[PDB]
Design a protein around this ligand. Structure first.
Ligand SMILES: [Cl-]
Ligand SMILES: [Cl-]
Lengths: 258, 258
């Protein structure tokens, strides 16, 4: 069963990547990004549900869908995380696939279909990039950490104050690539990622990837980042902090003061 | 002679790309980026000067070099524009090659060796990406423009105020990829790029690329962005504004108030 979930997840990613590649970089003059997202989601759902008709699927547009009233297994998908990147021709958006068992992610994929880079996290296994194991790196102190976040403008209210406290303490704050930064963290090239306002379809896949690489990912209070997808779950936004090194993670929590 | 300059420039880029690819993503535990930069520069200079022994070369580390007291032709190079991207494993740095005749760029290359994307601007020709012509796009008003800049933190003093006036007027401000944003602008996926603090080795190659795509690139006063490389030229930093559409460019100048 487990390796069957992985095989189907990879089939889904393969289909999404072909769809996305058809539409990427077509807009130099419904928009291609909306067609691409919808068509990619459909391609993924189709192969998932053909294999697993008792499973549910969750997506931004259609919300929860399941042929039954409830499901033990829920696939939570974002064909294009990083729409602004996609729209502007920057190949650092990603396709995110998560499978949840009883509300907990057991598999996550971050796929960059232009670069042909696929990170796969599976509970029980070390995370891989294109089939090869990866690991986070150690970091001596927050002052030595390379930090990413998507944009300085995606922090509102009290969250902006909190971000700034961490931002001012790191080696350097870098910007602009959505899920891709978490992939880099999982491969040991980035020490910290701090974001505010992520929907569950844009973080659940990250969890197995990062944890299975040796990293840490929580909400800004240090609690488990969780979203139990269900017929009534609300796709609200969460604050995320991921680190390659647990000591860095704690220093970040202490600066956020959330 | 002209097509000979292009052929040699491409040879230089091919060599740099192999060197860079050897070192990219090696640092997950002299640094690889410094070895890569030095070795790539050496590879480029070697083939340039083997072909053109009367030419000069200019680089960050070694400054002006020429076997003669003066030169009509000067190659101005940056093997790795976007060192922070390189160091953190993000494949959006670029290799920049410019050839100047009497101080004016006649050829520019933006090469992304991981993505295998090469933009070439040559005076007299339309700009190409991987051999295919590209063009900028029209934009109706600054309020519709997609803007890129590397980082919010790379504006100091009065330049930060000026950037903010433009930033607040565009459709959306996006961040994080150095020369790559100018390549996207040249291909018609980005409308505006506004940066402060660019060395001449990080802007001269951009000029033929953007102009030959139909765009506009100047300093923040709208004057020609120029740097006459010479035995005594000083590699200071410049403010740059590039637009796909001349009307947008002028609206940006009016907001910068430089
Ligand atoms: Cl089933
Ligand atoms: Cl010569």
């Amino acid at each position: 069963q487990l390796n069957h979930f992985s095989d189907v997840a990879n089939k889904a990613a393969n289909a999404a990547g072909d769809v996305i590649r058809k539409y990427f970089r077509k807009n130099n003059f419904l928009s291609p990004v909306t067609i691409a997202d919808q068509s990619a989601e459909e391609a993924m759902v189709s192969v998932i549900l053909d294999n697993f008709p008792s499973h549910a699927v969750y997506g931004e547009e259609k919300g929860w869908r399941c042929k039954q009233d409830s499901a033990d297994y829920v696939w939570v998908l974002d064909p294009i995380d990083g729409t602004k990147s996609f729209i502007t021709g920057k190949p650092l958006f990603g396709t995110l696939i998560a499978l949840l068992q009883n509300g907990t992610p057991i598999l996550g994929i971050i796929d960059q279909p232009v670069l042909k880079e696929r990170w796969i996290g599976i509970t029980g296994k070390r995370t891989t990039l294109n089939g090869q194991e990866v690991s986070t790196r150690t970091c001596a102190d927050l002052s030595q950490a390379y930090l990413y976040t998507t944009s300085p403008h995606l922090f509102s209210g009290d969250a902006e104050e909190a971000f700034i406290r961490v931002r001012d303490k790191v080696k350097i704050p870098l910007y602009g690539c959505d899920c891709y930064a978490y992939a880099l963290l999982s491969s040991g090239f980035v020490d910290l990622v701090v974001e505010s306002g992520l929907k569950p379809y844009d973080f659940l896949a990250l969890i197995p990837v990062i944890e299975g690489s040796g990293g840490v990912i929580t909400d800004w209070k240090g609690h488990q980042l969780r979203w139990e997808a269900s017929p009534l779950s609300i796709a609200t936004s969460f604050n995320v902090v991921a680190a390659g090194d647990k000591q860095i993670h704690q220093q970040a929590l202490d600066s956020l003061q959330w």
